[PDB]
Amino acid sequence: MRLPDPYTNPEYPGLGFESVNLVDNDPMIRDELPNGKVKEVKISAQYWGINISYPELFPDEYAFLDSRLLEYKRTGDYLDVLLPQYEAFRVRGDTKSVTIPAGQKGSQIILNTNGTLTGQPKAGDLFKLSTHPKVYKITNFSSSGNVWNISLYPDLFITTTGSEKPVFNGILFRTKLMNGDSFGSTLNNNGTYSGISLSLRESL
Amino acid sequence: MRLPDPYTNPEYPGLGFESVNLVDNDPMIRDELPNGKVKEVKISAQYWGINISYPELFPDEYAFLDSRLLEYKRTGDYLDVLLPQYEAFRVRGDTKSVTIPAGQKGSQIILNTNGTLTGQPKAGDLFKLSTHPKVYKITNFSSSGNVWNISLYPDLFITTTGSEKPVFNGILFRTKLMNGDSFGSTLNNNGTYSGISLSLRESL
Amino acid sequence: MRLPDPYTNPEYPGLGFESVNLVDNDPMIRDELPNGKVKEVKISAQYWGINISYPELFPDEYAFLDSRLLEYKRTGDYLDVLLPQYEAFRVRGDTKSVTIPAGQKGSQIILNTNGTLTGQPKAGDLFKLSTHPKVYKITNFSSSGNVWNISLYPDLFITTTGSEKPVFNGILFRTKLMNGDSFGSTLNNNGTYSGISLSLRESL
Amino acid sequence: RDFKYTPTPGGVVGAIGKNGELSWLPSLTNNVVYYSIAHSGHVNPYIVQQLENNPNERMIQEIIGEPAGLAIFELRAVDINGRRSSPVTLSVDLNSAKNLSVVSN
Amino acid sequence: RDFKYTPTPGGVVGAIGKNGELSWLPSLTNNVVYYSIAHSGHVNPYIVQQLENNPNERMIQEIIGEPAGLAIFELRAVDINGRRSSPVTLSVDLNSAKNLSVVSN
Amino acid sequence: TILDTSESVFKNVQGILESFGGAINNLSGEYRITVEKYSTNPLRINFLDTYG
Amino acid sequence: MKKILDSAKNYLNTHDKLKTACLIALELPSSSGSAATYIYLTDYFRDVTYNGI
């Protein structure tokens, strides 16, 4: 399920994201030895945290947003969040004729584009596999012919089976709405709803 | 009993919500798995919470208000409130001749108007069964002629027994006060009671 | 690896420290005797701490910056930084033909330039040995012809082996991030990432 | 179904020879998590995990460097609860010239 | 040496199905204390200690109760210093522990 | 030793060990039987290597 | 003391960020002793395959 944004629903301009906050949550056990050497240990997973802020909402905008959020809480679905700043179209073509060799469980994807894709991905972009909902950021990219060497920040959450297909454009965050236990919005005497905030967390 | 408001007592326009906060309170056993998956189990019942803020109240209006509140505290019954933003009379007609077939549990509900009601209840509006005092919130609507399919955010607390009648207008929340233990009112030199507010909470 | 900055990437002038805080962190066993005498014992190693604050970063500059930071977090190596206020090239020449006699421990150090270097390193400037990555701070200087006597605030971590070469320019701190666990960036409606800051900490 | 060993006749160096891969269509029954194939030369079985749900869509597992000679393969599907399926057996003799696919269609 | 498996047609040990037996010749290197064998699908490798008389007569270990099908047996030895021989593999198919009568009708 | 098998194997092993002050421990799956002895090759630990 | 591989010591000394994982191999009950099963678990963010398990 997609969170309402002024792409799909421009008739409600108040539903735009006044300010997004992409939080990098990678819990680690960091210990500082007296000999000056700082040591880290990583066990848990990394999850992208998204915080959405909203302006004053008119009754119709709030009605639409609240209906969507209540539909989410009713069906127990997953809110999809689209960040416009990450929607630069660089890689274009078909992602079905590209092959990803299997057995890749590290933090690096080696894929043979088979010359079917034009353009090259840029470092810091958003990358995602077609068979897993986790979202990756490209930290480095070296192309030697048709084989690409894409480096990802989160260690690969799945081991490639050889059937996965890279996804570069149209990437959505399969988030789950936090702070929904006590979710409310105050209606002022002037008819507009205020104090609406969405603390979302990537529940892959 | 009924909480006084300009609809019941028009002679006191000082009564009436300066701002109402309709919060959603669904307790949940949320657990953040190490693999990134978030698992939440719903066990405790959900309850709407209403935070009412009053404007400058003159001495007679506050006398009426706190007289009613103290009668509430004395006889110990429940305190009904009528939110006015949800009082858009979008469904005309008399709902006695509307039958809800028995044996229905969950969010979905099916009711047959038998060609009596005029008007379509859009998403975001309130809904309440005749017998049970719980107040739901319509999230999606779909009708095939006379039969109406309504999806409600909180699951039906009680399974329909075939006699419950829909209540699309004049919905009252059966609430209980949460500020009773220490409830003070300040009188200014201007002659008005300032900062009167209520933290209500739906019971059952 | 190298932290991006306008010297390495002049095309991104948004990178570059709006304000840098170079803190001194020497843990000590301080004890306040009842007679008024204060006794402190140095046991734990000292480490410089660097707090970097960035100005308004545009989306492409932040993409480059967080791509580099996520590559840091991925490959797990150290993150070198170059403080520009200490980049006053006060010592010309090539330091390969400069010998530091072996068997020297403590703050004092003696190095023979053999008539190669031009320029006097005044007090307050940085100093770093070729082999060890520790960064010192010159506190006093005294030269008798070619031989230079330099006093450093932190005692020499390793005793000179007769091959270490002085590094009076281009000194990089081998640091580790301390904000990695929860590192979020907010995007304004103006189109800039605001309040980006780093709490670095020298490792070893 | 369709446990078919698809061999690659590519001329590879003698020291390490890339044996052709093998394919087997996903099990019809849902709630299958991975696929454990026994191997002649390896005690441990190769495992391929089916996270997605793509019926009628083939899957591939490849073996490289195995010695030339007789080979026997036994593949079994595994349930999410822990059940294991019946074995699927296929024995193929490994040789560079013997590396020719079955007649198709 | 001689790491071979000979099936047992009729097998019973304490009234339970007995499969064949697998045998091998002791390593020529001295000071070997036991011969460890790894069995596919089993957490615990089968270990049988040697004997002072082993230098002459090969030892044998029996496998009982396993189902009919493929088994991968890996044999390697140890030294009192921990030194280990290179593993010896034997990929074979096993008969049922107790050949059961077919369904009457 | 007279190992009365009636008693638990735990008790018998403890009784044997208490005779010569030895100790048995299993960490990492190896059963170590060791006694308090002087060694000429200890593991060098420095206070800096230690935590604070 | 339990000695470890030389490569293990080199990796532990050289690498400061260790990505550890605990691989629980728990036994599972069954009515008859002729049936045995195991449930494998780990706290790592992704399933870990060791010895084909």
Curated annotation (Swiss-Prot), chains A, B, C:
Q: Name one GO cellular component term.
A: virus tail, baseplate
Q: Which Pfam families does the record match to this protein?
A: DTP-pb9_A-dom_C, DTP-pb9_A-dom_N, DTP-pb9_B-dom
Q: What keyword terms does UniProt attach to this protein?
A: Late protein, Viral tail protein, Virion
Respond yes or no to whether keyword Lyase is given for this record.
Answer: no
Localization per record? Virion
Chief place of localization: virion
Subunit details for this protein? Homohexamer. Interacts with baseplate tube protein p140 and baseplate hub protein pb3.
Present the record's domain note.
Possesses OB-fold domains probably serving host adhesion properties.
* Function in brief: Forms the simplified baseplate, together with the p132 collar protein, the baseplate tube protein p140 and baseplate hub protein pb3.
Q: What is this protein called?
A: Distal tail protein pb9
Lineage, top ranks: Viruses, Duplodnaviria, Heunggongvirae, Uroviricota, Caudoviricetes
From Swiss-Prot, chain F:
Protein name in the entry = Baseplate hub protein pb3
What is the top-level taxon of the source organism? Answer: Viruses
Q: What induces it?
A: Expressed in the late phase of the viral replicative cycle.
Record's comment on post-translational modification: Ubiquitinated by the Bil antiviral defense system when this protein is expressed in E.coli MG1655 strain expressing the Bil system.
Under the subunit heading, UniProt states: Homotrimer. Forms a pseudo-hexameric ring. Interacts with distal tail protein pb9 and straight fiber protein pb4.
Where does the UniProt annotation locate this protein? Virion
Function noted in UniProt: Forms the simplified baseplate, together with the p132 collar protein, the baseplate tube protein p140 and distal tail protein pb9. Closes the tail tube and, upon infection, opens to form a channel thereby anchoring the tube to the outer membrane. These changes allow the tape measure protein pb2 to be expelled and phage DNA to be transferred to the host. Also forms the start of the central straight fiber, which is continued with the straight fiber protein pb4.
* UniProt source species: Escherichia phage T5 (Enterobacteria phage T5)
Parent protein range shown?
Answer: 529 to 580 of 949
**Recorded name of the encoding gene:** D16
